[PDB]
Design an enzyme around this catalytic site. Sequence first.
Site, PDB file in Angstrom:
ATOM      1  N   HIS A 176       0.857  -1.184   0.000  1.00 51.92           N
ATOM      2  CA  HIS A 176       0.000   0.000   0.000  1.00 51.92           C
ATOM      3  C   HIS A 176       0.895   1.236   0.000  1.00 51.92           C
ATOM      4  CE1 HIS A 176      -2.919   2.975   0.659  1.00 51.92           C
ATOM      5  NE2 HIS A 176      -3.755   2.309   1.434  1.00 51.92           N
ATOM      6  N   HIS A 179      -2.831   6.908  -1.100  1.00 59.69           N
ATOM      7  CA  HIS A 179      -3.750   7.610  -0.218  1.00 59.69           C
ATOM      8  C   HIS A 179      -3.200   8.373   0.987  1.00 59.69           C
ATOM      9  CE1 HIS A 179      -6.455   4.169  -1.896  1.00 59.69           C
ATOM     10  NE2 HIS A 179      -6.104   5.038  -2.826  1.00 59.69           N
ATOM     11  N   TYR A 181      -0.643   7.724   2.981  1.00 57.67           N
ATOM     12  CA  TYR A 181      -0.069   6.980   4.087  1.00 57.67           C
ATOM     13  C   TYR A 181       1.459   6.985   4.084  1.00 57.67           C
ATOM     14  CZ  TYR A 181      -4.843   6.008   5.114  1.00 57.67           C
ATOM     15  OH  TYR A 181      -6.171   6.181   5.429  1.00 57.67           O
TER      16      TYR A 181
HETATM   17  C1  FMN Z   1     -14.919   1.900   3.456  1.00 54.73           C
HETATM   18  C2  FMN Z   1     -13.661   1.917   2.566  1.00 54.73           C
HETATM   19  C3  FMN Z   1     -12.457   1.416   2.977  1.00 54.73           C
HETATM   20  C4  FMN Z   1     -11.255   1.412   2.150  1.00 54.73           C
HETATM   21  N1  FMN Z   1     -10.094   0.876   2.640  1.00 54.73           N
HETATM   22  C5  FMN Z   1      -9.009   0.871   1.875  1.00 54.73           C
HETATM   23  C6  FMN Z   1      -7.741   0.289   2.351  1.00 54.73           C
HETATM   24  O1  FMN Z   1      -7.599  -0.222   3.466  1.00 54.73           O
HETATM   25  N2  FMN Z   1      -6.705   0.345   1.492  1.00 54.73           N
HETATM   26  C7  FMN Z   1      -6.745   0.911   0.180  1.00 54.73           C
HETATM   27  O2  FMN Z   1      -5.726   0.891  -0.472  1.00 54.73           O
HETATM   28  N3  FMN Z   1      -7.913   1.437  -0.266  1.00 54.73           N
HETATM   29  C8  FMN Z   1      -8.998   1.436   0.498  1.00 54.73           C
HETATM   30  N4  FMN Z   1     -10.184   1.965   0.024  1.00 54.73           N
HETATM   31  C9  FMN Z   1     -10.188   2.500  -1.358  1.00 54.73           C
HETATM   32  C10 FMN Z   1     -10.656   1.339  -2.259  1.00 54.73           C
HETATM   33  O3  FMN Z   1      -9.713   0.288  -2.376  1.00 54.73           O
HETATM   34  C11 FMN Z   1     -10.995   1.667  -3.723  1.00 54.73           C
HETATM   35  O4  FMN Z   1      -9.819   2.288  -4.320  1.00 54.73           O
HETATM   36  C12 FMN Z   1     -12.148   2.614  -3.889  1.00 54.73           C
HETATM   37  O5  FMN Z   1     -13.279   2.115  -3.131  1.00 54.73           O
HETATM   38  C13 FMN Z   1     -12.537   2.686  -5.344  1.00 54.73           C
HETATM   39  O6  FMN Z   1     -13.715   3.459  -5.550  1.00 54.73           O
HETATM   40  P1  FMN Z   1     -15.167   2.833  -5.441  1.00 54.73           P
HETATM   41  O7  FMN Z   1     -15.558   2.774  -3.986  1.00 54.73           O
HETATM   42  O8  FMN Z   1     -16.027   3.857  -6.258  1.00 54.73           O
HETATM   43  O9  FMN Z   1     -15.141   1.500  -6.137  1.00 54.73           O
HETATM   44  C14 FMN Z   1     -11.378   1.988   0.814  1.00 54.73           C
HETATM   45  C15 FMN Z   1     -12.627   2.503   0.403  1.00 54.73           C
HETATM   46  C16 FMN Z   1     -13.770   2.494   1.213  1.00 54.73           C
HETATM   47  C17 FMN Z   1     -15.065   3.054   0.705  1.00 54.73           C
END
Ligand code: FMN
Length: 368
Positions: A176, A179, A181
Amino acid sequence: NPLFSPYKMGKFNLSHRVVLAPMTRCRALNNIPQAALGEYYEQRATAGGFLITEGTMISPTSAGFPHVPGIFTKEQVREWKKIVDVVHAKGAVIFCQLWHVGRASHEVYQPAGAAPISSTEKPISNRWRILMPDGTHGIYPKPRAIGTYEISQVVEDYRRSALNAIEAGFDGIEIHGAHGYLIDQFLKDGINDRTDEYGGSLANRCKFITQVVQAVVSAIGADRVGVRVSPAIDHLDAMDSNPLSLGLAVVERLNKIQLHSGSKLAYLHVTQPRYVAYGQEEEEARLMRTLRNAYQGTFICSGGYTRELGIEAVAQGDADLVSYGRLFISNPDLVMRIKLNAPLNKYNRKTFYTQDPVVGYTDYPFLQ
Ligand SMILES: Cc1cc2nc3c(=O)[nH]c(=O)nc-3n(C[C@H](O)[C@H](O)[C@H](O)COP(=O)(O)O)c2cc1C
């Protein structure tokens, strides 16, 4: 329908291109994988489908959310194996996302309430608030900037966690590096204000992710290693003066790693931003296509994708696989639903991060 044409990701023969994007759900009480995770992932697993777990802790100081799973202790490994087995039993492929939040933490999530680590001493601004154990929001504190030696200790945590992931049975891990981090805190010039060899130029800012990737590759092999970045996403005050330049700089380092290592990575995973218009190829699309064209290997696009956008992405060659987050939360059978072009359950954000093992986690209904 392009989303359902097979795709060979390394040794993995994927039957379709719909991927479960990594999503923090906070059901892993006290960082211990729970049976709930097992049912959750099992519900979404499909024969020949690819799943990526919620971000997972690589050490005691890597968390910034409550009850996120870890994979740095043998106990956690044991519990992850049971989840990995239930998923494999469905014929799915699953990678564990290794996650360190860096400065996006709080004393409540740090051993002895110590300060979170980072590339800088600057804290996330007050425009962003951290989720607290009691469900309320908190203030991001000033982090502690780590030195060369400590950087190598964190790299080692990624390494050790990658070995643990493999020991648990995972088919691979996803670094990862997006975002806002830890890794992203070294990548973005809007955060990285270092004056040593990990800051300044693109090469220096890319050093940390390169060392991290190299360490896991040398540990479990490039074929079981995926990498995720998001140069154009500024989540948590993680902006760069030149998103496209930074992304390409990262892509070049990865290509270089593959060539020297003599093997390709599992894939490059990129989250893209989505602009907002009114009651409704373009800069954003071109930036994604550009990173894809520059990267020598499998490309997974993510961020606001729908059935329509997904098909389009695969059909135009903009991506090999499409990861879905929110729709996969409310639709356990999202793959089936997309294939039949059936209705989609709406997702309730209120239970995105609650701790119940069932409510808002596994009680979303399948197609009837
Ligand atoms: C509730 C939630 C938790 C997420 N947790 C992570 C995470 O732990 N790691 C990460 O790389 N992206 C995380 N994401 C981003 C998602 O992997 C993904 O890139 C994103 O949901 C894509 O857009 P979409 O929700 O329209 O499909 C999260 C998104 C949501 C809504």
